[PDB]
């Protein structure tokens, strides 16, 4: 049956948009469908920057940070990312916390 209301892909009243391909398995999915997420990390390890960057004149220069936007798919998300199932009557929220 119609196991979800908007069963696929957050798409009502337009038909078709374009596909955008997954990163690790490289399956093709339409960009409205599978997965949004931003993945900001950093660009340094555990820094210990007071003697990592005492060498760095113009002191520390950045607080350096990179941005990455990702596109998983349905068929590879539940083999890394921790959802893997949800029950019947709890599939309703949209904010992550």
């Amino acid at each position: 049956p119609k196991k979800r209301a908007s069963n696929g892909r957050n798409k009502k009243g337009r038909g078709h948009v374009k596909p955008v391909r997954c990163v690790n398995c490289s399956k093709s999915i339409p960009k409205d469908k599978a997965i949004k997420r931003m993945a900001i990390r950093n660009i340094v390890e555990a820094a210990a920057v007071r003697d990592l960057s005492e060498a760095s004149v113009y002191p520390e220069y950045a607080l350096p940070k990179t941005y990455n936007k990702l596109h998983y798919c349905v068929s590879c998300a539940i083999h890394a990312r921790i959802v893997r199932v949800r029950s019947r009557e709890d599939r309703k929220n949209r904010a992550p916390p």
């Binding site: 660009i43 760095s56 798919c73």
Partner: protein, 127 residues
Amino acid sequence: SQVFGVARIYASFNDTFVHVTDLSGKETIARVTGGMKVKADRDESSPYAAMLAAQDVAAKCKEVGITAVHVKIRATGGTRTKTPGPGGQAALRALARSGLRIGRIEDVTPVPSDSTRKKGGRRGRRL
């Protein structure tokens, strides 16, 4: 007071490149791979096999005059899959062992304004 090289590592997947150059670019200095130091081919992504690569890279450069450097890292880059791996986090600490002089640590992974579609088929490389 200082003189700046450009470290500019290449920590892609299944490899690790690192070579200081002049900022002119067309006078490079002493590239070193994941295959230079240790040989098992499992060791292309170990931490301590990635630190030895920048180890021989660093003290070879001080013998020429490279005191200060400009680290400006690079992942796979482009439509090649864009994310830093086990080298850029790890082997940059192997420039901290010399007390060598750092700066400007962000990436130059090139950005496709989407073009010339990827590989692995439409359906994707299922295992």
